[PDB]
Amino acid sequence: MKPLSSPLQQYWQTVVERLPEPLAEESLSAQAKSVLTFSDFVQDSVIAHPEWLTELESQPPQADEWQHYAAWLQEALCNVSDEAGLMRELRLFRRRIMVRIAWAQTLALVTEESILQQLSYLAETLIVAARDWLYDACCREWGTPCNAQGEAQPLLILGMGKLGGGELNFSSDIDLIFAWPERELDNAQFFTRMGQRLIKVLDQPTQDGFVYRVDMRLRPFGESGPLVLSFAALEDYYQEQGRDWERYAMVKARIMGDSEGVYANELRAMLRPFVFRRYIDFSVIQSLRNMKGMIAREVRRRGLTDNIKLGAGGIREIEFIVQVFQLIRGGREPSLQSRSLLPTLSAIAELHLLSENDAEQLRVAYLFLRRLENLLQSINDEQTQTLPSDELNRARLAWAMDFADWPQLTGALTAHMTNVRRVFNELIG
């Protein structure tokens, strides 16, 4: 923790003459002040729930805290009777844990890798608790537990992108896909209705805010098609119409909740031969080259940019590099079938698919970029991918990235992106 810079000192002075009871300046540790100075999101959250900042000193957050999320949430949902009570608690819990994550990340009390796990597990935990509670309600309300010839049918959810990969952004949509395996009230209508209530419970702004903005657009047949599909229809779609951009996306797909059952297993079985082909020819490699060209043309087109995600050498190019190796060799190398980028990168190094120089530079660039973007997002809990233009937020980021000033932060960033762009250009050359 490098003491606050001139601009952060002038801003903190505007925050103190404004802080509510019981948060007077004398009841505040040196870290509490730096976190409040860094994040308007944490400020606003602790104004309404002052206990939270008080409870962050009586028990600071540990890396493995995510192992308690599900039990903490089930305890808070013990005295919940109706949907409005479910929604209220999911919202409160998300905000409460998010504050603790912002706390840990701001002060570097745990590593970014552990922040990534905390964010992803929080989201998993909330999705699953929501789904479980609504399954029960919909069964008790609408025509009993839905079945197929006696056997009860569950709702399965795939988390996609960074959620599936266990590397969620600090302020993020959750991209999901809904499916059910095999009637009572008719299975298809039942799960559509439940799917609608689930999206509402997670995403509807109330007086307590929302849990996550939900994005269902990656599902088969896009925004226009059904909200939930049977396994048969899921299977048919990918086997018959599935394309390489879809294989790329499905590298990340992970079942939320318990991934262990006859149904969880048929799903994983559909995806394995689709994503990870065992036989690769020139047409597969050229497809990947064309996808690479499309990214490179998009970059060239947008020109000079402060976008950390889409810029040349950005997060999206690292994901592309890694997933390209997974699509080529994953079928023959089980270590490249992981949903998470960083273990994949480790396997890429062990297999000598990249040099150690290249692989370690990619890992370090990835963690720098993710820390930088997730810190930035935690300032106001917004989904921004672009570096700030204003002096306060630039000053804020430099300080939190263990650096001295903004010119130097951008120099270190520029050097990491240069390494990524070199590896990206050499990729399937």
Resolution, angstroms, 1 dp: 2.0
**Quick one: which H or E segment has residue 306?**
none
Quote the CA–CA distance of 324 and 76 in Å, as a whole number.
43
Quote the CA–CA distance of 213 and 76 in Å, as a whole number.
22
Backbone dihedral region of 219: left (phi > 0), alpha (psi from -120 to 50 degrees) or beta?
beta
Experimental technique used to determine this entry: X-ray
Q: Where are the domains of the chain?
A: 2-110, 111-276, 277-429
As given in the structure block, the two tokens for residue 34 are 């730096």
Quote the CA–CA distance of 1 and 400 in Å, as a whole number.
8
The domain covering 277-429 belongs, at the CATH homologous superfamily level, to: Nucleotidyltransferases  domain 2 (1.20.120.330)
Quote the CA–CA distance of 372 and 385 in Å, as a whole number.
10
Pairing of strands 174-180, 214-215: parallel
Backbone dihedral region of 402: left (phi > 0), alpha (psi from -120 to 50 degrees) or beta?
left
Query: Could you please report the per-residue DSSP string of 221-263?
Result: TGGGS-SEEEHHHHHHHHHHH--HHHHHHHTS-EESS---SHH
Residue 175 three-state SS: strand
Tell me, what DSSP letter sits at residue 158?
E
Quote the CA–CA distance of 39 and 376 in Å, as a whole number.
9
The CB-side HSE value for 322 (13 A sphere, CA atoms) comes to 32
The domain covering 111-276 belongs, at the CATH homologous superfamily level, to: Beta Polymerase, domain 2 (3.30.460.10)
Count of CB atoms within 10 A of residue 21's CB?
Answer: 7
Quote the CA–CA distance of 425 and 124 in Å, as a whole number.
35
Amino acid at 418: T
Q: Which residue's structure tokens are 């949430």?
A: 73
Residue 201 three-state SS: helix
The CATH number of domain 2-110, selected from 1.10.4050.10, 3.40.50.2300, 1.20.1440.230, 1.10.3720.10? 1.10.4050.10
Upstream peptide bond of 22 is cis (omega within 30 degrees of 0): yes
Count of CB atoms within 10 A of residue 97's CB?
Answer: 24
Phi and psi at 177, nearest 5°, equal -135, 135
Q: Please enumerate in sequence order all residues whose Cβ is within 8 A of that of 336, keeping only pairs 6 or more positions apart, or say none.
A: 325, 326, 329, 330, 344, 347, 348, 351
